Symmetry: C2
Subunit: 173 residues, 2 copies
């Protein structure tokens, strides 16, 4: 049982710009069936990097690409949930990590991050809506303003307003 291991984006699917890209679809009962088949990669003619579960058409769509792939666009739909395989979400930071999209959600001293959508325990102005493109989803460590210090979060310790998260540089020699 693996659905909890994917990065979820609600009300979202992906569309192919380039018509050469593969897609596999199958009518299914539940989203965890899409997850199981992706994790296990059984009967997929490609490496499964993400999948969509269509609650209206009751299908899985498995993709050899994700929301960050070139030639793919997001599409909004109430019926769709998107799930991206963490192994294909870059888990290291380039520069200050403005483009960080990973799912680390704990600060350097081990504090679970506060959700961006919450004002508890800390009140703040980094509402997701004011920062489209910065993926201020859930409680992920982010660096929305591209600041020296790298990805950070408001902290769920009322004593510690915010702290940096300890995410490794992809390449530093």
């Amino acid at each position: 049982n693996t659905i909890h291991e994917f990065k979820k984006s609600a009300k979202t699917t992906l569309i192919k710009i380039d018509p050469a890209l593969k897609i596999k679809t199958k009518k299914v009962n539940t989203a965890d069936q899409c997850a199981n088949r992706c994790t296990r990669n059984k009967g997929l003619p490609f490496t499964c990097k993400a999948f969509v579960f269509d609650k209206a058409r009751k299908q899985c769509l498995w993709f050899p690409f994700n929301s960050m792939s070139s030639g793919v666009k997001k599409e909004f739909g109430h019926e769709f949930d998107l799930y991206e395989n963490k192994d294909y979400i870059r888990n290291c930071i380039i520069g200050k990590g403005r483009s960080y999209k990973g799912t680390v959600s704990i600060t350097k001293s081990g504090i679970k991050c506060q959700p961006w959508s919450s004002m508890i325990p800390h009140e703040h102005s980094f509402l997701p809506s004011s920062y489209r493109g910065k993926d201020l989803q859930e409680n992920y460590c982010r660096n929305p303003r591209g600041e020296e210090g790298g990805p950070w979060c408001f902290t769920s310790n009322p004593e510690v307003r915010y702290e940096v998260c300890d995410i490794p540089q992809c390449s530093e020699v």
Copy 2:
């Protein structure tokens, strides 16, 4: 929760930088270390790896893994090292000589044959002669650091070997 880690058998880590935090505790099973590490509860740092000392039944949790500076790998038959996937670089630089992630499915979606197995393919890439190259389990690897990037022998008899589809670190923003 133990599945979220890559295991290196007979391996522990030692801090050369004595400032780096550690936390230990007698436990019953390696599963219980993994649980605490994933949940990160009551750890005054971000947990990236732990060692289970199978002799003393003790966990050692760490804010570093084998790729970190200030630390050194070591053989030792009572130890197992478990590294949290989120801190093992999951993109490659060029030919990917140094790729140590856990992707074990080929471009066309085929489960890799373990480096240790000779079914369905016999070969001369036994772990022993490629020391340091991490030819363990059925992970995509580039032991000889050659053009083409990481690959594996395939569980499909029809298909001896195939490259893996691991993204370049430069692929995305």
